[PDB]
RNA sequence: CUUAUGACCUGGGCUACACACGUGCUACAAUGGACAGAACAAAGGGCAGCGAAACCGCGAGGUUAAGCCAAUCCCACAAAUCUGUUCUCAGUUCGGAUCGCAGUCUGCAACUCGACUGCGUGAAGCUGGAAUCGCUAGUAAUCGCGGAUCAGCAUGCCGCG
């Protein structure tokens, strides 16, 4: 590591709106986030909203 | 951001929310009424409570992420099934 | 840390037992992660070279290199020795921290992220990620962001085959 | 039609019922471009008179939301 | 010409546009945009026609139905305008065209083929070349209202304020 050519690395606690906390060596002392890995639906397996709205059309023969 | 897209910070919440596709005038006003923010506030001046309120409201409601795909699916369907309407679509 | 222990304790033993290797260190390892910019607009915007250099220093403290054209081209109005793009090589704790940040924020932060490309393998055991947005993860300062030129990430592994590299990435958490 | 019910010609509906009671078979010719496509139309390669000829068209599942005229062009160029 | 240059019917076309040009409407914004409150109208129509009032629906509109063959009742609560709140000079909280979906009036059926409403966007466009048009007083400019043709269709026509 060269002297002064790079910024100082600092351990930070990556936060999420859902409460998940992650730690990574970052320039910022802290990093606020809204959607972490688990917060994103794709990482939640079969997302409820997507799995519910992903049904194929039925011609709307209800009426 | 709330819907993954930045919003103007120096504008009222009502119109700041309209910049999100799928969330227009009526939808934005209804979301603001549900959140209880009075519709006269800056978005740069807010707190975690009413921020997460709108966030969860949007996550529960439809979003541009879903609309972009639904409209494209419908367009491709009506284009593939024949549908002289769809023929005009393809023609532009 | 948060990644080194997880790897050494879950990925190495499990993958070794799965692939029936004849030695401990025969397990494939992620050697490095190379980030390339490749901005070619420097011809029309001499200051564009400064762009993605101040951003790369924030993405990773390791300062990038001002790569220069090894060959001139008229179709692109190029001359040998002129700056093009930027290069960064992460080896050590830096690459682990970069992987952690990526998996934790960047991929989930993308709006329409679903089933990342599977054919991104180079055919030898290396993975490449094609980014087209310049503001993927929080260290990019959306406010200061003016251009949306994405990034090019190259993951290099000691894998001799693509299947074992795929298994390693999936066990690490690559959401294929 | 909004709540009065879907729209179809009586003769065409009778033909389709006769053809579906046993098995789907040869094209069902008709001049009723007005008729709206129903789920029963599926599998039947109906024909539409575009003014000078009959164009046989295989009605798939997703065709229920369109009319025969949408698949029977008239203008030429 | 005439068992066809005549006649019956389904469908199509009369509504296609790389185009150019007459007439009209809408726009490019701060004499402005959106929201809250308030006033004044003039003429004309009503019998398978006009339809109060009530309910439902953001909505176009739907249901029960009073009244009227009419100085009675209805169509039908005119808008510009004023007093307030709000935004701020930007291709914008301008314009709503093209546009996807969901609906309303009618009618056997708005798909070639009406209008209207809500949803989400939104360009062309920031005043427009020669040249050219109308206007001498309640005229110019401009805001609404009613009838003809009409099951359902008006930026055009007729008139009114």
From Swiss-Prot, chain A:
Domain of life according to the entry: Bacteria
Keywords, ordered alphabetically: Metal-binding, Ribonucleoprotein, Ribosomal protein, RNA-binding, rRNA-binding, Zinc
Binding locations of Zn(2+): 16, 18, 36, 39
Conditions for induction: Only accumulates during exponential growth.
Record-level GO cellular component terms: ribonucleoprotein complex; ribosome
The keyword Ribosomal protein appears for this protein: yes
GO molecular function: metal ion binding; rRNA binding; structural constituent of ribosome
Cofactor annotation: Zn(2+)
Gene Ontology biological process: translation
Cofactor binding: number and manner: Binds 1 zinc ion per subunit. This zinc stabilizes the protein.
Main function: Binds the 23S rRNA. While neither of the L31 paralogs is essential, this protein seems to function as the main L31 protein. Has a lower affinity for 70S ribosomes than the non-zinc-containing paralog L31B (ytiA); is displaced by it to varying extents, even under zinc-replete conditions.
Subunit (UniProt): Part of the 50S ribosomal subunit during exponential growth.
PANTHER family reported in the protein's UniProt record: 50S RIBOSOMAL PROTEIN L31, CHLOROPLASTIC, LARGE RIBOSOMAL SUBUNIT PROTEIN BL31C
Family according to the record: Belongs to the bacterial ribosomal protein bL31 family. Type A subfamily.
Protein's name according to its UniProt entry: Large ribosomal subunit protein bL31
Gene from which this protein is expressed: rpmE
From Swiss-Prot, chain B:
tRNA-binding in keyword set: yes
Membrane-crossing residue ranges in chain numbering: none
UniProt keyword terms in alphabetical order: Ribonucleoprotein, Ribosomal protein, RNA-binding, rRNA-binding, tRNA-binding
GO molecular function: rRNA binding; structural constituent of ribosome; tRNA binding
One cellular component term from this protein's GO annotations in UniProt: cytosol
Record carries keyword tRNA-binding: yes
Gene Ontology BP term (one): translation
Protein family membership: Belongs to the universal ribosomal protein uS13 family.
Subunit record text: Part of the 30S ribosomal subunit. Forms a loose heterodimer with protein S19. Forms two bridges to the 50S subunit in the 70S ribosome.
Reported function: Located at the top of the head of the 30S subunit, it contacts several helices of the 16S rRNA. In the 70S ribosome it contacts the 23S rRNA (bridge B1a) and protein L5 of the 50S subunit (bridge B1b), connecting the 2 subunits; these bridges are implicated in subunit movement. Contacts the tRNAs in the A and P-sites.
Protein name as annotated: Small ribosomal subunit protein uS13
Organism field: Bacillus subtilis (strain 168)
Gene that produces this protein: rpsM
Swiss-Prot record, chain C:
UniProt record, GO biological process: translation
Single GO term (MF): structural constituent of ribosome
Record's keyword terms, sorted: Ribonucleoprotein, Ribosomal protein, RNA-binding, rRNA-binding, tRNA-binding
GO cellular component, one term: cytosolic large ribosomal subunit
Domain of life: Bacteria
Pfam families reported in the protein's UniProt record: Ribosomal_L5, Ribosomal_L5_C
InterPro entries listed in its UniProt record: Ribosomal_uL5, Ribosomal_uL5_bac-type, Ribosomal_uL5_C, Ribosomal_uL5_CS, Ribosomal_uL5_dom_sf, Ribosomal_uL5_N
Quaternary organization: Part of the 50S ribosomal subunit. Part of the 5S rRNA/L5/L18/L25 subcomplex. Contacts the 5S rRNA and the P site tRNA. Forms a bridge to the 30S subunit in the 70S ribosome. Interacts with VmlR. In stalled ribosomes contacts MutS2.
Protein purpose: This is one of the proteins that bind and probably mediate the attachment of the 5S RNA into the large ribosomal subunit, where it forms part of the central protuberance. In the 70S ribosome it contacts protein S13 of the 30S subunit (bridge B1b), connecting the 2 subunits; this bridge is implicated in subunit movement. Contacts the P site tRNA; the 5S rRNA and some of its associated proteins might help stabilize positioning of ribosome-bound tRNAs.
Assigned protein family: Belongs to the universal ribosomal protein uL5 family.
UniProt protein name: Large ribosomal subunit protein uL5
Origin species: Bacillus subtilis (strain 168)
Swiss-Prot record, chain D:
GO molecular function, one term: structural constituent of ribosome
Any one GO biological process: ribosomal small subunit assembly
Domain of life: Bacteria
GO CC, alphabetical: cytoplasm; small ribosomal subunit
Key words, A-Z: Ribonucleoprotein, Ribosomal protein, RNA-binding, rRNA-binding
Subunit structure: Part of the 30S ribosomal subunit.
Function: Protein S19 forms a complex with S13 that binds strongly to the 16S ribosomal RNA.
Similarity section: Belongs to the universal ribosomal protein uS19 family.
Protein name: Small ribosomal subunit protein uS19
Gene that encodes it: rpsS
């Amino acid at each position: 590591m060269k002297a002064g050519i790079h910024p100082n690395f600092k351990k930070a606690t990556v936060k999420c709106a859902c409460g998940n906390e992650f730690e990574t060596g970052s320039v910022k002392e802290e990093v606020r986030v809204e959607i972490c890995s688990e917060c994103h639906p794709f990482y939640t397996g079969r997302q409820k909203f997507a799995s519910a709205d992903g049904r194929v059309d039925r011609f709307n023969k209800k009426y | 951001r709330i819907a993954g897209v930045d919003i103007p910070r120096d504008k009222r919440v009502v119109i700041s929310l309209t910049y999100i596709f799928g969330i227009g005038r009526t939808t934005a006003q209804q979301v603001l009424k549900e959140a209880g923010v009075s519709e006269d506030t800056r978005v740069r001046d807010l707190t975690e409570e009413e921020l997460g309120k709108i966030r969860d409201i949007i996550d529960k409601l439809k979003v541009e992420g879903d609309l972009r795909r639904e409209v494209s699916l419908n367009i491709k369907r009506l284009i593939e099934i024949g549908s002289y309407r769809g023929i005009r679509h393809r023609r532009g | 840390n948060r990644l080194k222990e997880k790897y050494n304790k879950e990925i190495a033993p499990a993958l070794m037992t799965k692939f029936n290797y004849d030695s401990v260190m025969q397990v494939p390892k992620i050697e490095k992660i190379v980030i390339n910019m490749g901005v070619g607009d420097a011809v029309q915007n001499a200051k564009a070279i400064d762009s993605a250099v101040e951003e790369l220093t924030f993405i990773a403290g390791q300062k990038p290199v001002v790569t220069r054209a090894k060959k001139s081209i008229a179709g692109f109005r190029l001359r040998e020795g002129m700056p093009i793009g930027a290069k960064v090589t992460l080896r050590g704790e830096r690459m682990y921290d970069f992987l952690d940040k990526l998996i934790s924020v960047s991929l989930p932060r993308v709006r329409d992220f679903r089933g990342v490309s599977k054919k991104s393998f180079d055919g030898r055991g290396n993975y490449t990620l094609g980014i087209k947005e310049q503001l993927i993860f929080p260290e990019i300062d959306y406010d200061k962001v003016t251009k949306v030129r994405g990034m090019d990430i190259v993951i290099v592994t000691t894998a001799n085959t693509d299947e074992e590299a795929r298994e390693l990435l999936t066990q690490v958490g690559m959401p294929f | 039609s909004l709540k009065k019910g879907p729209f179809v010609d009586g003769h065409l509906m009778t033909k389709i019922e006769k053809l579906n009671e046993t098995d789907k078979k040869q094209v069902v010719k008709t001049w009723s471009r007005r008729s709206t496509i129903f789920p029963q139309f599926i599998g039947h390669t109906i024909a539409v008179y575009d003014g000078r000829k009959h164009v046989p068209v295989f009605i798939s599942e997703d065709m229920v939301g369109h009319k025969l005229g949408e698949f029977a062009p008239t203008r030429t160029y």
